[PDB]
Each structure stands twice: as structure tokens, then as C-alpha cells.
Symmetry: C2
């Protein structure tokens, strides 16, 4: 009934800087397309030392959901990281839980207008049938 | 090196994946959408193991007793745009899972993987990809700013 999408910010502990004129780093979660409804999404934001990344309930993860907060208009969730620079030792984890819906969801580390940065997309569709054919995918180094 | 590995976990939910008569064997097809991702120089490895081992991270020791190399037993066809794997059965038990590792040159774009019939008319399909929004070749384009993953369920 529910699906959870996990977005890790600065998963490899690098210096992430947005040139002056770009504004702060933001993370936008939504669906290019059919669209995925986000009005009933459960959102949690965690902060941790990048050295910890590769269970988000562990003491190594600090719940900062209230400190950063986020906007949600039903089709896009936006998080302001409050800075144009995230140090190599800083990482965040955004958990978005929504009713199981078929479709494509995307997450970014970009400017508020999505004209600069990086965008990852994840999708699942049932070709047809009621079989329990299932898989999980991901791109990793 | 600049390579990334596109990992597909087969049956991470630990359920019996059964294809009724007429659908043929279970297959996994890996390809792209759209610029298409070039798979001509892809390095492919296939592993067999128990579903209870598959993690959301997919960052495991694929060189452990847990995993067995079945790359040759299964084999695969790769025409450069599509990789097709015949699982040789219409029934994969709840305690059987596979992991397909496709190592390719670091590229932007969206790849997809299926657990379907040979013709992709039945089953499930998943897509995953990333892209540089502005297309600028700067410091940020050289690093991974984020990662996205779907939490899998294993009842």
C-alpha cells in the first residue's frame, strides 16, 4: 500500500558548491510526467556525517525535518538546504513515503528552477498480469 | 576509470515468481529509453543467491560464499541497446534471487530492467537514470550530488 523513496544528498562525501548567482542548493522531488500524487506523502529529513553513508533510525542520523522543512504542492516537494555549499563531511537523507503508485518519480540537487544540478529518476510499471514478478534496480560505483 | 554499475536484483521480495503456460520462461531485459545508453562495451556478471541477502544499498560483497557466479550458465544476448537474459524456467522460487551487474562507461540517461516474458508483454518493468541538468562540464558534473533508491519490501 505504501512505497518509500530514499534520496541521499552527498552520498560520497564531496565538496558540493553552487556558483554565486545560482542561489542555494535545493532538492526537488516530483514526477516529470500518469503523474504521482504527493499530497499524502510522509517526509523525513535526516542529517549525518558523510563518513556514515554508503538504517536511518540509528543515532548517527539526526532528524532535522523541522529545521529544514519543505514545501509540497501535490506534484513537487521542495527542500531548501539553506546554503550554496555542502561540505565533504555533510550528508542528508530524505525519505518520502507515498501510497504505492505506478509511475516515475525524480529527485534533484539543483537550483529552485531546475536549470542547474543533477536529477535522478526512478520508475516502476506493471507491463501486465498479476504475477509476483519483481526486481529492484540502482546505479552505483 | 569512470564506470558505473547498473545493478538489477531479481526477486528481492522473496516471492514465487510464476509464469503460467503460454508465457514461456521468465526473462530479464535491460535497455534504455530516451539519448539511448550504449551497452556495446558493457561488462556483465550474473549471480545467484537467497533473497534475504539483497539490500536496498546493493553495495554487497559479490565475491562472497553467499553469491555464486552463474554468468556462463545463463549467458545473455547484447546487441548494444538491449541485454536479454533467459532464466530458463517459468518458475523462480521464493528462496531464489539473482543479481545482474552491468558495468558501463559513466553515462547520463535512463536504463530499464524487466522480469517479463521474452517479448516484454507480461510482467514488471523498472527504470532508473540520472542526468546533468544544465549540461555544464564543471566540478559538480564530476561528482555524485545525490542518489535515489526505492525501498524494497521483503515480508
Amino acid at each position: 500500500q505504501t512505497e518509500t523513496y530514499i534520496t541521499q544528498i552527498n552520498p560520497e562525501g564531496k565538496e558540493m558548491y553552487f556558483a554565486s548567482g545560482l542561489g542555494n542548493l535545493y532538492t526537488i522531488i516530483g514526477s516529470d510526467g500518469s503523474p504521482v500524487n504527493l499530497l499524502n506523502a510522509e517526509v523525513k529529513i535526516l542529517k549525518t556525517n558523510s563518513k556514515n553513508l554508503t538504517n536511518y533510525d540509528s543515532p548517527e542520523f539526526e532528524d532535522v525535518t523541522s529545521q529544514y522543512s519543505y514545501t509540497n504542492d501535490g506534484s513537487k516537494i521542495t527542500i531548501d538546504w539553506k546554503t550554496n555549499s555542502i561540505s565533504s563531511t555533510t550528508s542528508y537523507v530524505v525519505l518520502v513515503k507515498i501510497p504505492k503508485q505506478s509511475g516515475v518519480l525524480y529527485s534533484t540537487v539543483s537550483d529552485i528552477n531546475q536549470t542547474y544540478g543533477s536529477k535522478y529518476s526512478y520508475g516502476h510499471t506493471n507491463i501486465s498480469g498479476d504475477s509476483d514478478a519483481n526486481a529492484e534496480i540502482k546505479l552505483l560505483s
